[PDB]
Amino acid sequence: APQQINDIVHRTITPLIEQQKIPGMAVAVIYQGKPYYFTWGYADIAKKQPVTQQTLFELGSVSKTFTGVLGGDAIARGEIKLSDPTTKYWPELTAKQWNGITLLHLATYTAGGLPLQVPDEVKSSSDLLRFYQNWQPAWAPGTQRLYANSSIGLFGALAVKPSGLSFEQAMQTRVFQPLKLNHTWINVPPAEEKNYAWGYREGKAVHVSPGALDAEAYGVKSTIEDMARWVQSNLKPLDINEKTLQQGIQLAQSRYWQTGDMYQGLGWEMLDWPVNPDSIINGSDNKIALAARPVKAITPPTPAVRASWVHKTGATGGFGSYVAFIPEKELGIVMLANKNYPNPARVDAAWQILNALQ
Ligand SMILES: [Cl-]
Ligand code: NA
């Protein structure tokens, strides 16, 4: 790796790991479009299994960027439109409150107060229907942004209906396989479990449990190599051979809503580069990132802006992830850790590295 990258990564990540007591971590820096990998610590403490470039991490909500791109791909194929009402694809929901909620609202958390988590007691398709049927919105659609698994998770489930594929099959055939993400999984195959790191919560090893819409909202596991390639693809979509996938990535980084300094894409979130680091650092705190905030529609949606800070945080019980990149600079970073540690610490480290390398 270039000496500049080694210097800043070891200056930044090494103190972070000790200060946060992170058992194992993998970092990829994309510099001038090429990836450079770094690994620390253990994927399994008890068995002393080290983290490698093959170690699988739970991505948590970084999975939402795959869902956003998969939906974008379906838009580009002419299968769905963001302005379509939810009831076109789930007619059993036909009701006053749901006729005015579109796929855009679901994809961008602007449906009007869909909850952060799907209740743990929702365990069947009938449970899920009844859950959305009896949901009482708090705001009119298109006025408030409330980050929610039950929002974009439903977008992913509905966006694949016209394809006739399951969500996993559509993701595998339309995103993972064309991009050669051969070690990225919604369901880890038996032969790959050996690489599945343990997450650690309060000194206990944990893996994320099955939940309704987990695959769409937080159920992807990946290696640092595949995630570096995911950043490469989102940095340089025009190099992708499949037109609809290139366009899906561009659609996912387009700006549909504005809240303060940030713009909402499909899965991805964007700010104008250069950014005020305090904005994204403090803005990643859950007291802020999970709060309801008013939105302004952007008309037409702004096409993917090159001078952007594009990023997404992710968390499960035992894992914490972060992805950020700057298309104008061909510059990005992936941070995967098997402990869920505060988002502001992730963003601070990521910005220090990318700002030093611009
Ligand atoms: Cl390695
Ligand atoms: Na609206």
Residue numbers in the entry: 4 to 361
Copy out sentences from the published article reporting this entry, exactly as the authors wrote them.
To enable future efforts on the optimization of bicyclic boronates, we report crystallographic and kinetic studies on inhibition of the clinically important class C AmpC β-lactamase from Escherichia coli (AmpCEC) by TAN, a previously reported model bicyclic boronate 2 (CB2), and a thioether bicyclic boronate derivative (CB3) that we have recently shown to have enhanced potency against some SBLs and MBLs in vitro. Many β-lactamases are encoded by plasmids, but the AmpC type β-lactamases that are present in most Escherichia coli strains are chromosomally encoded. In all three structures, analysis of the electron density maps for the AmpCEC active site indicates that the bicyclic boronates CB2, TAN, and CB3 have reacted with the nucleophilic S64 to form an anionic tetrahedral species in which the boron is sp3 hybridized, as observed for other bicyclic boronate SBL complex structures.
AmpCEC was co-crystallized with CB2 giving crystals with four molecules in each asymmetric unit, all of which manifested clear and continuous electron density for the covalently bound CB2 at the active site. The overall folds and orientations of active site residues and CB2 are very similar in all four chains (main chain RMSD of Chain B, C and D in relation to chain A: 0.31, 0.28, and 0.33 Å, respectively). Binding of the bicyclic boronate core of CB2, together with that of the amido side chain group portion, is very similar to that observed for TAN (CB3 has a different type of side chain). Although the AmpCEC-CB2 complex was co-crystallized using a different crystallization condition than for the two other structures reported here, because the Q120 side chain does not interact with residues of other AmpCEC molecules in the crystalline lattice, reorientation due to formation of crystal contacts seems unlikely. It is thus unclear whether the different orientation of Q120 compared to apo-AmpCEC is due to the different crystallization conditions or due to a specific feature of CB2 binding. The positioning of the Q120 side chain could impact on the potency of inhibition by bicyclic boronates containing an amido side chain, as in CB2 and TAN.
